[PDB]
């Protein structure tokens, strides 16, 4: 079949098809996740309030395991194919090992698929970056991040999508270690509206607890945005 080498090296030791796949993520929608003491929250951008979108509310953060959920940034068609490989891997794991899959195991599989598309004939890399959060069987909250080069790394507060470096350098000087549940949802809002416009119908946040995952609805999200919007006015008043 067609297996010509696409991902090749530059004369400066760079991979052009990987550096150009990262540029497709930097135009994707921003997704921010932070790590607390008993909960994991991840918030995505949820392109717009189109008024033409279905009244059936469409989730952006996809379910992969019973406790491990995933949010991405990049091409939304490439990410669907990547997750149905990972949703097929969880049922391969609890058919050969009788166990619930760890969070660090699923990220090593998805990063193994990202790297496998960077070293194949006829294949471009996946133009997606993922934020993966979930708990183990013994609590222990986790938060991970894969890039189109295939490098997995666990984070304490991670942001992907457009303006990647802008959020991460902001929330590394405002992060408090060991937050409660209400502090994580409040901290994921104030990092995500730094980049997205001030609209209230373009945040989709999710709170991960042990055997309990609760999506925030319309009116519950209104309670946390106003507490952030009144505080960023105080942050501007603190500068002047």
């Amino acid at each position: 079949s067609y297996d010509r080498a696409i991902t090749v090296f530059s004369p400066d030791g760079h991979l052009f098809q990987v550096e150009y796949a990262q540029e497709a993520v930097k135009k994707g929608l921003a997704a921010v996740g932070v790590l607390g003491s008993d909960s994991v929250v991840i918030a995505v951008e949820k392109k717009s309030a189109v008024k033409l979108q279905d009244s059936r509310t469409i989730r952006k953060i996809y379910k992969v395991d019973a406790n491990i959920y995933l949010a991405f940034a990049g091409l939304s068609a490439d990410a669907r194919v990547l997750i149905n490989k990972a949703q097929l891997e969880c049922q391969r794991f609890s058919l050969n090992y009788e166990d619930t899959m760890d969070v660090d195991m699923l990220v090593r599989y998805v990063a193994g698929v990202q790297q496998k598309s960077t070293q194949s004939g006829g294949s471009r890399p996946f133009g997606v970056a993922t934020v993966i959060g979930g708990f183990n069987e013994d609590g222990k909250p986790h938060l991970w991040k894969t890039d189109p080069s295939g490098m997995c790394s666990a984070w304490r507060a991670v942001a992907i999508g457009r303006h990647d470096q802008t959020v991460i350098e902001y929330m590394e000087k405002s992060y408090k270690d060991g937050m409660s549940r209400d502090e994580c949802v409040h901290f994921a809002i104030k990092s995500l509206l730094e980049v997205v416009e001030s609209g209230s119908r373009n945040i989709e946040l999710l709170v991960l607890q042990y055997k309990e995952a609760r999506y925030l609805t319309e009116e519950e999200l209104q309670k946390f945005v106003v507490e952030v919007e009144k505080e960023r006015e105080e942050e501007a008043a603190a500068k002047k």
Binding site: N96, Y97, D99, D102, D104, R108
Partner: protein
């Protein structure tokens, strides 16, 4: 072969004989019928001598590769499921092996049992082999959950002996292990003929 093992308040005790007979001829008398998989698991042997020593060496390779990739120990619920998926895949190939896995994972004890046909069962009390039918009647009479460490070692060593005495395919040197929370220790290792003049002097 008369391998047995039971689970009680204090861990798991594994007890075997050491005899391999190819019919009416005794091939050997010092066969290790417990392959220690690693320093917290055990595996036992019954049936074909090569079918057990091969696939529990394959099982000891899949448990070592688990610790390399995932950085942590393998459970026993994952360890037998590796051995049961291998065994069920070759169920029409005429294998003959009946193996117990016993170990201390992070959920306490667990004593499983794998056939040569893909079965896996979870109890606290087994006895496998051709002479195992002799080892049930002396063990079921004296088993209780809250035995002491010394009395359950005595009940295991005495329940092997009454089956080695009666079955032609069983005997040799009774080996008793003890699976506690830190791993396993070889408790005793003694001849069956020396053990006759202790129990009936």
């Amino acid at each position: 072969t008369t391998t047995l093992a039971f689970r009680f308040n204090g861990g798991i005790i594994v007890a075997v004989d050491s005899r391999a007979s190819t019919g009416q001829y005794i091939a050997s008398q010092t066969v290790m019928k417990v392959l220690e998989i690693n320093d917290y698991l055990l595996g036992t042997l019954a049936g074909g001598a090569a079918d057990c020593q091969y696939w529990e060496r394959v099982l000891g390779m899949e448990c070592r590769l688990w610790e390399l990739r995932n950085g942590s120990r393998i459970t026993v619920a994952a360890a037998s499921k590796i051995l049961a998926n291998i065994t069920y895949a070759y169920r029409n190939h005429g294998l003959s092996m009946g193996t117990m896995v016993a170990g201390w994972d992070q959920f306490g004890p667990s004593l499983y049992y794998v056939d040569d046909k893909g079965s896996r069962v979870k109890q606290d009390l087994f006895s496998v082999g051709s002479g195992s039918i002799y080892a049930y009647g002396v063990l079921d009479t004296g088993y209780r959950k809250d035995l002491s460490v010394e009395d359950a070692c005595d009940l295991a060593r005495r329940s092997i002996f009454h089956a080695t005495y009666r079955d032609g395919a069983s005997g040799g040197i009774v080996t008793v292990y003890h699976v506690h929370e830190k791993g396993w220790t070889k408790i005793s290792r003694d001849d069956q003929t020396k053990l006759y003049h202790r129990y009936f002097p």
